[PDB]
Amino acid sequence: YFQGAMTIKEMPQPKTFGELKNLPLLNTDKPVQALMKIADELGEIFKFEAPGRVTRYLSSQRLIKEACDESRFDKNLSQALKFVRDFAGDGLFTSWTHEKNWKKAHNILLPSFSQQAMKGYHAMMVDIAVQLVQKWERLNADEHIEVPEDMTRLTLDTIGLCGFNYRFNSFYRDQPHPFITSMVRALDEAMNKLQRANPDDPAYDENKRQFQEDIKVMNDLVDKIIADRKAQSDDLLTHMLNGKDPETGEPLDDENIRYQIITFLIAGHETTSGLLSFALYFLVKNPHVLQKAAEEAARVLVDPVPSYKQVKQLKYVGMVLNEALRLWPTAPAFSLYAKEDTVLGGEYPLEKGDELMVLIPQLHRDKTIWGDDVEEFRPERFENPSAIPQHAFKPFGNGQRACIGQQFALHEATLVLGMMLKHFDFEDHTNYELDIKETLTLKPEGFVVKAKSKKIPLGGI
Ligand code: HEM
Ligand SMILES: CCCCCCCCCCCCCCCC(=O)NCC(=O)O
C-alpha cells in the first residue's frame, strides 16, 4: 500500500517577501527570540525559507521525540553551523556524522570525558573557582560584578587548564581576553551572515576582512597552546596528540587537531558561561529559590574547598542549573535531516535530505509536558528525573551527536554556583531588566549584581 501520511494539511509558514522568502522576518539581532514568537503564533511546526534554503522549526515534544530517532534522522549542519565550520572545520561540533574525522575524533576523545577523567579535572576546576571567589571577596564597597564577563573568565580558564594545561589568566585582565573578543566577533559575524541575501557584495568586504582577522587571533592562541605543550599531563590535548582511533589504528592529523582545539575552547566554555549567568539571574529574581539553594550549599560544602563527592551532593544546585537550561538553553537549537523519505508525526511528509530545526527554548515551554506554569522558574520540576518524558528536555542535543562535555559543564557549574552561594549574599541592585544577547548562543547582556561576603574562609587549592 501507498506509504504516505493519512492526512496532510497546509504547512504553517510566516509571511514571505518575494525572492527573499522569510528572511526579512529575522532582520534582528535576536533571531532565536523572534523565532520563538513565530512558534507561539504558528504552533508545533512551521516552514522557514531563505534564498537557496528551507527548514522546518519544531517546537513540540511530540514531534521532537520522533526527530530524535537516530534511525530516521541524523545531525544536520544548520546554516549557522555551516558558517562556524569555516573556522572550526571538521572539529567535533561542526563535522558531519559521516565525515571521516567525526567518528575518529569521537572515539579518540570520549575517554577524556569519562567518570575518571572528571574526577581528575576537579582540582583544576577548584583552582579557577577559588580565583573567581577571591576576585569578588576583593572588591571595594562601591563596586559591582559584571556577571557574564566574570563567568566567561571562569569558564574559559577552566577549559584552558583542564583540557590543555594552559593558563589564559583571565582574572589577571580587566578587559576580556583577546581570544574572547575575536571569538564573540566571529560568532556575531556568523549570525549576521544568516540575514545577508547577497553575502558576496563588496559591501561585506570589511566584514570578511575582520572575520579573517578574528580567525587569525583564535588560531594564534591555538599555536601558543600547542607550542606550550611542547615546552607532563594526560588530558584532552594529550589525547588529541597521541590517541589512536581504535577503528583506523591512527591518531588525528595536525589539521584536525587544530580544529578540535578551536572547537573545545569555544564549545567548552561559552554556553557554560551563559548557563551560570542565567542561573544567577534567576536566583536573584526568585529570592526563595536562592535561599533554599544557599542552604544546601551551606549544608554540604563544609570544607574550605569542595570535594568531588560534595559537588555530586549539591542536588538542588543541580536542579537550579537544569531549570535555567529549561528556560534558556544556551545553544538554543540543533538541526537534523531525514535519512530517507518519511512522515513526521503522522502528518508532515518529508523527503530524504529535508531539514528540521529543534527550537529548544520552545520545546522546553511545551505545556503538555510541563504544565501551564512553563514561564516560572521552579527547580522542583527536576526533583525526580525519572518523571520527565524522553526527549522533553534537550539542552545538550541528541544521541551520538549529543554534547560530549555535558557532565564537565554541569560539574563545573554546580561547583561554582555552590561556592558562590556559600560565600556570598547577592543583590540585584539595579533591578536588572533581562536582555538576552544572541551570538548563535544566548547570554544575558549587562547583567550586574553586588555580592556581600559572608566572610567564610577559603582553603588553599
Ligand atoms: C551548559 C553548557 C553546554 C550546553 C548547553 C551544550 C550544548 C550542546 C549541544 C546542544 C550540542 C549539540 C549540537 C548539535 O547537535 O548541533 C553540543 C555539542 C557538543 N558540545 Fe556541548 N554544551 C555545553 C558545554 C560543553 C562543554 C563544556 C564542552 C567541552 C568540553 C562541550 C563540547 C561539545 C562538543 C565537542 C560537541 C559536539 C559533539 C559531537 O557531535 O560529537 N559542550 N553541546
Ligand atoms: C565551534 C563551536 C561551535 C560553537 C557554535 C555554537 C552554536 C550553538 C547553536 C546555534 C543556534 C543556531 C540558531 C540559529 C537561529 C537562526 O537565526 N536561524 C535563522 C536563519 O537560519 O536565517
β-strand partners of 338? 73
Is 155 designated active site?
A: no
Does the C-beta of 330 come closer than 6 Å to ligand 1?
yes
Single-letter amino acid, residue 140: N
d(CA 392, CA 368): 10
Ligand 1: residue whose CA is nearest its atom 37 = 93
Q: With b meaning 16 or more CB within 10 Å and e meaning fewer, what string describes 241-264?
A: eebebeeeeebbeeebbbbbbbbb
Query: 3-state SS string over 165-181?
Result: CCCCCHHHCCCCCHHHH
d(CA 31, CA 193): 12
Grid cell digits, residue 260:
578540535
Distance 423 CA to ligand 1 centre (A): 30
Does the C-beta of 441 come closer than 6 Å to ligand 1?
no
Q: Where are the domains of the chain?
A: 1-461
- Specify the pairing of strand 441-444 against strand 448-453: unpaired
Is 403 designated active site?
A: yes
d(CA 305, CA 130): 8
Helix 406-423 vs helix 315-327: crossing angle, to nearest 10:
110
Q: Are 445 and 436 in contact (CB under 8 A)?
A: yes
Ligand 1: residue whose CA is nearest its atom 22 = 403
State the catalytic residue, choosing from 87, 263, 403, 439: 403
For residue 250, the 8-state DSSP code is B
Distance 128 CA to ligand 2 centre (A): 29
Q: Are 114 and 124 in contact (CB under 8 A)?
A: no
Grid cell digits, residue 313:
551532593
Q: Are 67 and 397 in contact (CB under 8 A)?
A: no
Does the C-beta of 182 come closer than 6 Å to ligand 2?
no
Grid cell digits, residue 306:
569542595
Grid cell digits, residue 292:
533554599
**Method by which this entry was solved:** X-ray
Over the Cα atoms of the chain, what is R_g? Answer: 22
Q: Are 276 and 154 in contact (CB under 8 A)?
A: yes
Q: Which of 440, 441, 442, 443 to mutate to test the pocket of ligand 2 (most atoms within 8 A of CB)?
A: 440
d(CA 253, CA 257): 6
Report the Cα–Cα distance between both ends of the chain, in Å, rounded: 68
Grid cell digits, residue 153:
573568565
d(CA 65, CA 390): 7
d(CA 129, CA 64): 36
Q: In a 3-state reduction of DSSP, which class is residue 238?
A: helix
Alpha helices in 205-305 (DSSP H): 205-230, 236-242, 254-267, 270-285, 287-300
Distance 80 CA to ligand 2 centre (A): 4
Distance 90 CA to ligand 1 centre (A): 15
Yes or no: domain 1-461 corresponds to CATH 1.10.630.10? yes
Grid cell digits, residue 49:
525559507
Is 179 designated active site?
A: no
Sign of CA dihedral 421, 423, 428, 432: negative
Give the containing element (helix H, strand E) for 335: strand 333-338
d(CA 420, CA 425): 8
CB atoms within 10 A of CB 331: 19
d(CA 448, CA 49): 38
- Specify the pairing of strand 355-359 against strand 45-50: unpaired
State the catalytic residue, choosing from 271, 342, 414, 439: 271
Q: In a 3-state reduction of DSSP, which class is residue 74?
A: strand
d(CA 409, CA 280): 16
Grid cell digits, residue 278:
542565567
Give which of 278, 331, 328, 303 is closest to 445, Cα–Cα. 278
Does the C-beta of 23 come closer than 6 Å to ligand 1?
no
**Which residues carry a binding-site annotation for (9Z)-hexadecenoate?**
57
